[PDB]
Design an enzyme around this catalytic site. Structure first.
Site, PDB file in Angstrom:
ATOM      1  N   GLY A 103       0.564  -0.961  -0.273  1.00 13.54           N
ATOM      2  CA  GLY A 103      -0.014   0.119   0.095  1.00 13.54           C
ATOM      3  C   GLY A 103       0.458   0.941  -0.195  1.00 13.54           C
ATOM      4  N   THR A 124       2.074   3.381  -2.713  1.00 14.81           N
ATOM      5  CA  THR A 124       1.477   4.429  -3.466  1.00 14.81           C
ATOM      6  C   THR A 124      -0.048   4.745  -2.943  1.00 14.81           C
ATOM      7  OG1 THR A 124       2.173   2.963  -5.063  1.00 14.81           O
ATOM      8  CG2 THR A 124       0.449   4.611  -6.134  1.00 14.81           C
ATOM      9  N   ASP A 173       7.732   5.082 -10.148  1.00 15.17           N
ATOM     10  CA  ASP A 173       7.960   4.053 -11.160  1.00 15.17           C
ATOM     11  C   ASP A 173       7.562   4.558 -12.454  1.00 15.17           C
ATOM     12  OD1 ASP A 173       7.145   1.709  -9.626  1.00 15.17           O
ATOM     13  OD2 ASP A 173       4.864   1.560 -11.313  1.00 15.17           O
ATOM     14  N   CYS A 190     -10.540  -1.748   3.174  1.00 16.07           N
ATOM     15  CA  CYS A 190     -11.027  -1.390   2.762  1.00 16.07           C
ATOM     16  C   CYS A 190     -11.999  -2.773   1.555  1.00 16.07           C
ATOM     17  CB  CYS A 190     -11.322  -0.446   1.989  1.00 16.07           C
ATOM     18  SG  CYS A 190     -11.005   0.232   3.155  1.00 16.07           S
ATOM     19  N   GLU A 203     -11.012  -1.874  -4.177  1.00 16.85           N
ATOM     20  CA  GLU A 203     -10.330  -0.782  -4.412  1.00 16.85           C
ATOM     21  C   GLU A 203     -10.124   0.299  -4.154  1.00 16.85           C
ATOM     22  OE1 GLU A 203     -10.429   0.260  -8.505  1.00 16.85           O
ATOM     23  OE2 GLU A 203      -9.119  -1.731  -9.238  1.00 16.85           O
TER      24      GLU A 203
HETATM   25  N1  LIG Z   1      -6.369  -0.396   3.006  1.00 17.29           N
HETATM   26  C1  LIG Z   1      -7.019  -1.349   1.696  1.00 17.29           C
HETATM   27  N2  LIG Z   1      -8.246  -1.634   2.014  1.00 17.29           N
HETATM   28  C2  LIG Z   1      -8.432  -2.235   0.432  1.00 17.29           C
HETATM   29  N3  LIG Z   1      -7.606  -1.903  -0.735  1.00 17.29           N
HETATM   30  C3  LIG Z   1      -6.820  -2.002  -0.003  1.00 17.29           C
HETATM   31  C4  LIG Z   1      -6.050  -0.828   0.877  1.00 17.29           C
HETATM   32  N4  LIG Z   1      -4.645  -0.777   0.825  1.00 17.29           N
HETATM   33  C5  LIG Z   1      -4.464  -0.786  -0.612  1.00 17.29           C
HETATM   34  N5  LIG Z   1      -5.755  -1.098  -0.927  1.00 17.29           N
HETATM   35  C6  LIG Z   1      -5.269  -1.610  -2.780  1.00 17.29           C
HETATM   36  O1  LIG Z   1      -4.170  -2.676  -3.281  1.00 17.29           O
HETATM   37  C7  LIG Z   1      -3.963  -1.503  -4.456  1.00 17.29           C
HETATM   38  C8  LIG Z   1      -3.025  -0.726  -4.051  1.00 17.29           C
HETATM   39  O2  LIG Z   1      -1.884  -1.180  -3.854  1.00 17.29           O
HETATM   40  P1  LIG Z   1      -0.338  -0.516  -4.417  1.00 17.29           P
HETATM   41  O3  LIG Z   1      -0.738   0.073  -3.199  1.00 17.29           O
HETATM   42  O4  LIG Z   1      -0.469   0.493  -5.618  1.00 17.29           O
HETATM   43  O5  LIG Z   1       0.583  -1.368  -3.888  1.00 17.29           O
HETATM   44  P2  LIG Z   1       2.172  -0.768  -4.218  1.00 17.29           P
HETATM   45  O6  LIG Z   1       2.636   0.619  -2.961  1.00 17.29           O
HETATM   46  O7  LIG Z   1       3.214  -1.976  -3.537  1.00 17.29           O
HETATM   47  O8  LIG Z   1       2.843  -0.520  -5.335  1.00 17.29           O
HETATM   48  C9  LIG Z   1      -5.114  -0.614  -4.872  1.00 17.29           C
HETATM   49  O9  LIG Z   1      -6.079  -0.944  -6.328  1.00 17.29           O
HETATM   50  C10 LIG Z   1      -6.625  -1.323  -3.957  1.00 17.29           C
HETATM   51  O10 LIG Z   1      -7.223  -1.637  -3.929  1.00 17.29           O
END
Ligand SMILES: Nc1ncnc2c1ncn2[C@@H]1O[C@H](COP(=O)(O)OP(=O)(O)O)[C@@H](O)[C@H]1O
Ligand SMILES: Nc1ncnc2c1ncn2[C@@H]1O[C@H](COP(=O)(O)OP(=O)(O)O)[C@@H](O)[C@H]1O
Lengths: 325, 62, 307, 67
Positions: free
Chosen positions: C28, C30, C55, C273, C276
């Site tokens: 998470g 990003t 990225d 949550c 997405e």
């Molecule tokens: N707390 C959360 N609850 C639900 N979905 C989440 C949560 N955190 C991240 N996501 C999901 O993860 C995805 C983003 O992952 P991402 O942040 O890009 O991974 P990374 O940071 O390693 O690139 C999103 O599409 C989102 O749906």
């Protein structure tokens, strides 16, 4: 070509040593037991031993039985015997009964080779007092630390038996006058190690006598850690041919499934599975399903373990992963 | 003639540096496959460039 | 005299100018990057903000649902948050079409690639004549993007004892400066800080403990960890899935441990949550739990308005 | 030289080797807490034992660089 299961190993007759390992709470212990139970059920003739170094006494937890330093047999089995020992809480009891101490932490790999032979010892002892020879032993490799790194000890101890000498023969008048207050002992007792742990090495380097099985969950931090491990093993010249990918929730099709979150993870796992398959084409990639709640005790460990033989089919076998609630 | 310790210590250190820049252009997540392959490679060049460092050094020792 | 389990203190801070967000694995990073950004922007209307990402996959663009390029555009719906997506590995590869002394010395490529970014930024502030008060870095997923902070000390460790066959030793002293005027800044607890994102499982709490060490070494400031994707299952309207409630049990176990391991840290718990969290309307709603800590009881609903 | 490059390079290399054996006796999972603490420690001793390796080495390229 290469079947997506461990049938070929559970059926193998040649192997005598099998190592199971994997960092993170991925299912090392469960797999360790499963590969054990499966091998035992498929070869009644042979006698088996499942041994664990872990201090937390996992095998005991897994089966729901109290296994100790004394190789007992699994209640319900006939050729599977579990043994839980602590080589650290025994090393502080080996010598605890100076120079033979200040050269271990100095040389990388000794502590391990020492701790391992301490185990092998505790085993042959059992085979004596019990007069029962074990045909194959399965190692629940320790969670942390490079438990079996000693395989490099030989080529490493050679750089010293060719140094402790290349200095005893490059400074002659002072190698002679060099009244080594310490006898050839150090360069001779730590010379027999490069042997007492060079035979054991040509055991663990025989593609037909021993092999390693990696357990991993299908997420990035894990596929990494295990790619690392596979490399660490390749270096030791040990055989790595199979990876069991655990906790997969084949959510693509499920019974009583209508949850949104769960289907998001599967999508990710699926993504990496395809990559693992691409990365290790010559490997036995075993997919194991994620069951509802713990997989404890023989009746379940067995039911779950059969999917290491005949690969799990999410469609047909969908039920069998719910008899575990 | 400054061939092996020049044409080599460069071809490699250069190719490695050419790969390393290519690896940082793919998702270690979406292409775990390739990504890990390339890394394995960069792990060799990292050794056979650390060998030509001793082949070129033990030359000023022998 | 405990510490606040949130980033309020940082989203409120007026002193900071540089903020780094990072975390390997799909934890998470990003999302948190955007959340810390949006939150800071909404809480300080006066200041102007920039969210930049290295990225290649163009994540910020996916996150918001807008096409952000090399040109610092503003978030559609915001007023002081501007996102910028650039690739330094490709730009530094063109004015290089040698680096032999780069792969030889560990840390250059990074310092080089970084200043290549800084450049692309001040350029924007020129053609746009708009000064950015604070920039948030969506640190790259793999590789030690900001390792150059060791470059200075390292470069000393190879000058007193080591050597246009000398024009190299000239534009190299000119460097151990650009990177030291910086590291001086990044190493100031009031101007820049790092926020670690991690999921609450072992392989991740590890990788981040590692990271926190890598940062401590660089003498960078690490004070807050945001623990993402938590369940808090017991607090759902009702017990249904058992495989879930089994995971929460484990996460809870490590949370307690994290709390014990980092008592002086801002440990921020974020809820998982359903599906997405894309686009400003949601990134915002989700991001507020970085300020006022999420309460599973009361806020239970707010995590279901998200698609 | 003999009381510092000996009593130190041992007390440490020995204590480290005494901790390392203690760390492999707890669940990095059930005691992540302690476990990670101990590791952090072993990461220092690993440096201040790699320092006494240069302190004991700068005192040899010194007694021979100066008659
Ligand atoms: N707390 C959360 N609850 C639900 N979905 C989440 C949560 N955190 C991240 N996501 C999901 O993860 C995805 C983003 O992952 P991402 O942040 O890009 O991974 P990374 O940071 O390693 O690139 C999103 O599409 C989102 O749906
Ligand atoms: N494929 C699986 N499906 C469901 N539960 C599993 C699975 N694998 C392991 N478990 C659960 O995890 C627990 C075992 O974790 P364990 O294998 O001992 O972790 P580790 O290998 O790191 O020691 C068991 O109590 C079991 O219920």
């Amino acid at each position: 070509t290469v079947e997506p299961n461990l049938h070929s190993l559970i059926t193998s007759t040649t192997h005598k040593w099998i190592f199971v390992g994997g960092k993170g709470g991925v299912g090392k212990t469960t797999s360790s037991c499963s590969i054990a139970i499966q091998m035992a059920l498929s070869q009644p003739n042979k006698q088996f031993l499942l041994i664990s170094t872990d201090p937390a006494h996992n095998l005991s937890d897994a089966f729901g039985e109290k296994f100790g330093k004394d190789a007992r047999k699994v209640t319900g089995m006939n050729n599977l015997s579990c043994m839980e020992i602590d080589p650290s809480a025994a090393l502080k009891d080996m010598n605890d009964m100076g120079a033979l101490a200040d050269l271990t932490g100095s040389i990388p790999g000794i502590d391990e080779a020492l701790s391992f032979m301490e185990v092998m010892k505790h085993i042959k002892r059992q085979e004596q007092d019990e007069g029962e020879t074990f045909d194959t032993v399965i190692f629940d490799t320790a969670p942390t630390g490079h438990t079996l790194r000693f395989l490099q000890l030989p080529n490493t101890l050679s750089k010293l038996l060719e140094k402790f000498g290349e200095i005893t023969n490059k400074l002659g008048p002072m190698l002679n006058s060099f009244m080594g207050a310490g006898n050839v002992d150090i360069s001779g007792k730590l010379n027999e190690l490069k042997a007492n742990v060079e035979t054991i090495r040509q055991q663990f380097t025989d593609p037909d006598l021993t092999t390693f099985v990696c357990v991993c969950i299908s997420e990035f931090l894990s596929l990494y850690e295990t790619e690392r491990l596979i490399q660490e093993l390749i270096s030791y010249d040990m055989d790595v041919n199979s990876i069991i990918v655990n906790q997969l929730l084949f959510a693509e099709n499920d019974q009583e499934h209508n949850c949104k979150r769960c289907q998001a993870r599967w999508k990710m796992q699926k993504k990496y599975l395809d990559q693992i398959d691409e990365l290790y084409e010559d490997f036995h990639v075993v997919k194991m399903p994620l069951c509802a709640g713990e997989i404890r005790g023989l009746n379940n460990l067995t039911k779950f373990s059969q999917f290491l033989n005949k690969e799990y089919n999410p469609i047909t076998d969908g039920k069998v992963i719910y008899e575990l609630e | 003639p400054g061939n092996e310790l020049s044409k080599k210590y460069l071809a490699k250190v250069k190719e490695r540096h050419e790969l390393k820049e290519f690896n940082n252009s793919i998702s270690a997540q979406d292409n775990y496959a390739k990504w890990t392959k390339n890394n394995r490679k960069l792990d060799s060049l990292d050794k056979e460039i650390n060998n030509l460092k001793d082949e070129i050094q033990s030359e000023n020792k022998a």
